[PDB]
């Protein structure tokens, strides 16, 4: 997650695929994800 946007939005770099602006699933809490942390994302 390169950057956190403020419902918060997250900019995520999928290594080399592309840059995406995604939001967390209900499973995780917003406090858990911090800027610069590598996090998993669903393929769809």
Partner 1 sequence: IKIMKSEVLRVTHELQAMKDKIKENSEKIKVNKTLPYLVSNVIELLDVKCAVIKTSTRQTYFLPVIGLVDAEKLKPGDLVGVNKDSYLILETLPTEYDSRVKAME
Contacting residues toward partner 1, per CB under 8 A: 2-3, 5, 9, 11, 17-23, 35-36
Q: Which is nearer to partner 1, 32 or 35 (CB)?
A: 35
In the complex, least distance from residue 31 CB atom to partner 1, rounded to whole angstroms: 19
Shortest Cβ 3–partner 1 spacing (Å): 5
**What is the Cα–Cα distance from 16 to 29, expressed in whole angstroms?**
26
The total number of residues written for the chain in this structure: 44
| Residue 25 CB, nearest approach to partner 1 (Å) | 11
CA distance 25 to 10: 12
């Amino acid at each position: 997650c390169t950057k956190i946007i403020n419902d918060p939005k997250y900019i995520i770099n999928v290594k080399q695929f592309a840059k995406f602006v995604v939001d967390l699933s209900d499973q995780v809490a917003p406090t858990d994800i911090e800027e610069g942390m590598r996090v998993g994302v669903d393929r769809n």
